[PDB]
Design a protein around this nucleic acid. Structure first.
Lengths: 46, 271
RNA sequence: AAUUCCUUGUCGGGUAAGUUCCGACCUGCACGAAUGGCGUAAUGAUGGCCAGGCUGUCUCCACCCGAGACUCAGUGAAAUU
RNA sequence: GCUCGCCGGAAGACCAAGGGUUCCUGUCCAACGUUAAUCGGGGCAGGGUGAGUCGACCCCUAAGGCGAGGCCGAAAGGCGUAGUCGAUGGGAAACAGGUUAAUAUUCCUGUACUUGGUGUUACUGCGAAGGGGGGACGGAGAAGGCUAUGUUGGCCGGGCGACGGUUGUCCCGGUUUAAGCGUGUAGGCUGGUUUUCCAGGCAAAUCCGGAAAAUCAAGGCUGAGGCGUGAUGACGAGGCACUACGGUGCUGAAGCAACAAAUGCCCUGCUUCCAGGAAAAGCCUCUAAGCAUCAGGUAACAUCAAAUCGUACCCCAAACCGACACAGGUGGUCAGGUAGAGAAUACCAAGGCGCUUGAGAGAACUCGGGUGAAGGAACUAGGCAAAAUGGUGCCGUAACUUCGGGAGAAGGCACGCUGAUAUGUAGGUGAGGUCCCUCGCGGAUGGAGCUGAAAUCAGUCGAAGAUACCAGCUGGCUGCAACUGUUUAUUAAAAACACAGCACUGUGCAAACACGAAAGUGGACGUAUACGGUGUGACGCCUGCCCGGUGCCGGAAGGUUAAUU
RNA sequence: AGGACCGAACCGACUAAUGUUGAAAAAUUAGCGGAUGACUUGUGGCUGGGGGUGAAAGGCCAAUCAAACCGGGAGAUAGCU
């Protein structure tokens, strides 16, 4: 049976990539929150 | 000619088709072609604004000369062609200088005929002249609402317009719907009428034929739930309310014209 | 009657015996003409009924071929209390 | 190591997506592996991915995204022009053989090809963010000509039999070779050359389009395969020396013909139909502003350059998505033999596997199967389940019907093997010879060889000849929906939803209507034979009476009535 | 010629048995329907929560739908256990 997760690198970067987050005001706030918490991995870029 | 297929299988019992052997069987004129992508009834917001649109066969757009301002140069028609973008047919016309264009095909026009446009032009079908020089009581088609804007009336398969009378800088016309409209006596018109009257005698015969044209199925509305349509549901088939559209309008005689900007060129709207 | 409460209405057909099925009758509790009425060849993994063929479905169960169940060695769960 | 069993349109082979050292060698057995373990996709250490031609990057664009000025909006922000991004599509160039424990069209041997920079020489009208050509396109169907590939004969090497026969019409194996260059065939499309003139292609034009004459019909373009060369080469069954029996050097015969034949190629072709079938650049041409003894353009020769990143391994699965070494899911390419209509089915080749707990016993009962005396639905809510029918040819076939159907209706007869007609028939293929010729990959005649259905007659074996796998049960009456289709992923597939057809009603274009505080967009590059909404639901015969109530469409005297004054 | 006929690949899910701390949080085995079209499939793109999409079941929107998920108002309120 087919399951929900079907990986694709190109689609992953276009949806949650670093450049996608920086392109919108609300996306920039996501980075600020994660930086304050001290996350080691900011996004899914690598 | 109209031909009915034999009943060799269901879905072909009731099929009636219109066949015209005079139409050209070949590729069209490449220089006058353009692409045309489907929309699906969705606007730039991505939402559906018109329902029952989707699918169909791929089509290419043909540039047609509605303005018809090439005056004083005789032209000869070459061949007739099938246009998928409209119900009427089109004709390829070659001018004396050497330029080619597309025009709507009148009723009595065939290969080898001669047409011309302008005030000096003669009173023959396929000729375009200002309505000021057109004798009253004649039949015309492809009429312009404003001078130099291009024709916008009587462009269907077998429609036409008749000039009733003229008094000043205006003329009175009777439209196919029965309305009597007043327009400036400087617009252009073409003698005759669009020849495809057999277009309305065809019958699709099966559901698949409609899908070929890009029409999606329609859901009545009394078969939905209350949260979807005002006609709602019920235990069985109740329908105990006045007929109404989605969004709640009577749609059983209520009028919707509320322009009021012109409200001056209309005399005998209809009926 | 996909509609009939009284009801297994009454008569005829099919069965040794038919509250179902088919054909008539009209007392239509409470059918009816585009929220359509009455017919209709073909089509349907659609509802009801009757025949031929065929059989372990049954009268009534018997034997046989394989995988578990049982014994020995290794590993080693669960609900509940 | 020798036997046995299983898959073989895969349970074989090569990739994309995804994963990220699981790849090769040495060494170890605590934990991990549903048991043991010397073994492992486990622990530890070392080693392994070689490109001008393959892919990415790069040039060009589709849906769509972003968007200088600009338009709009309390703020945030929305839409969009010039532009700039975005493959799942278009765009130059390499093949065969050998080699490592682990990589190769990337290394080595042999033989090729493409695009640029500079120099020399010869001859010269060069120039674009502009014009034209080209690139460039659908479904179905029907043939003809070919190849991959297979079978048989010939040729070459080897063999004479564990038990009767086997020197022959006997047995086993092999019989392979590319890109490139030259030749331009089967076949497809189109009439050429010269001169003069012109309201068109935003200006120009020798180019494209149009008009009028003259003169000839051979002009051009596209094009599978075959043949020659590449090749005195490479490969090659088996022998013979090394050979830690893990494996290496050397040597090496024959290497042809006929027949059958694709879903692949000629074919982006041809015929036909209605629903009428992308864009841009590279490429080929034409000139403007300019520059002209310069600079540039065409051809030959020489020389230099072609960077950077990916390349191991699995990839229908133990390495990817399912918490697992999980009877699940996952796109493309390759397609042998016998029987067969077949990519179905049965048995096999190349190749790969026996699925990570075993050994005994032969109770009840449960699960998956085989056979059955006499009766044959008496079972049960119900013939649920099971049993049964099953192929090809010929004969034959009802009510009803929209004349197409119903229909494979129902039912009946014949099927193996051997010989003859005919030492292999009808048919297909086709050498030599002969003849012709625009002498070429040509035409006519000619028939050797090869391959090969079906039918009739006679004989013969068994209980049974469509013998296995494979492979329709049939008929009569009736309700509902016309029909093919669609639906509650995971208890409902239907009489429910769609449907062609029919009717009412709205809408004259800046259309009605819909998404949006707005700009704007869809409807539509459409125009009443058009578009939106509502009910009914093929087709045939038909669709009666009622306008008091509610809604909608008109009318207008009189009564009543807001802000304002 | 055909939303034509028989039947594999491919796409579906009408009947029965097994399984129900399953091999599997919806499968396996034997039969079954469509199979040139209103057909099926790979890659990328667009529509966002009182909103989307819907050949219309209150179906589907990441194993969750008569109003998704995450954080916040928040120690909401609870004459009831």
């Amino acid at each position: 049976m087919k399951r929900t997760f079907q990986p694709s690198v190109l689609k992953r970067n276009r949806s949650h990539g670093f450049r996608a987050r920086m392109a919108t005001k609300n996306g920039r706030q996501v980075l600020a929150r994660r930086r304050a918490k001290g996350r080691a991995r900011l996004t899914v870029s690598k | 000619a109209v031909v009915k297929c034999k009943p060799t299988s269901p879905g072909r019992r009731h099929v009636v088709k219109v066949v015209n052997p005079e139409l050209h069987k070949g590729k069209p004129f490449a220089p006058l072609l353009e692409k045309n992508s489907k929309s699906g009834g969705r606007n730039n917001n991505g939402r559906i604004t018109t329902r029952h649109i989707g699918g169909g066969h791929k089509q290419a757009y043909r540039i047609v000369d509605f303005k018809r301002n090439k005056d004083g140069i005789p032209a000869v028609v070459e061949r007739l062609e099938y246009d998928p973008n409209r119900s009427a047919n089109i004709a390829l016309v070659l001018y004396k200088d050497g330029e080619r264009r597309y025009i709507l095909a009148p009723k009595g026009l065939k290969a080898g005929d001669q047409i011309q446009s302008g005030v000096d032009a003669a009173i023959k079908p396929g000729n375009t002249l200002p309505m000021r020089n057109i004798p009253v009581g004649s039949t015309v088609h492809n009429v312009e609402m404003k001078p130099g804007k291009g024709g916008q009336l009587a462009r269907s398969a077998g429609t036409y317009v008749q000039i009733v009378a003229r008094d000043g800088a205006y003329v009175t016309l009777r439209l196919r719907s029965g309305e009597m409209r007043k327009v400036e006596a400087d617009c252009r018109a073409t003698l005759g009428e669009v020849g495809n009257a057999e277009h309305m005698l065809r019958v699709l015969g099966k559901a698949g034929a409609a899908r070929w044209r890009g029409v999606r199925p329609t859901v009545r509305g009394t078969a939905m739930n209350p949260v979807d349509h005002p006609h709602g549901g019920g235990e069985g088939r109740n329908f105990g309310k006045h007929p109404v559209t989605p969004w709640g309008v009577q749609t059983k005689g209520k009028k919707t014209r509320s322009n009021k900007r012109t409200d001056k060129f209309i005399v005998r709207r209809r009926s």
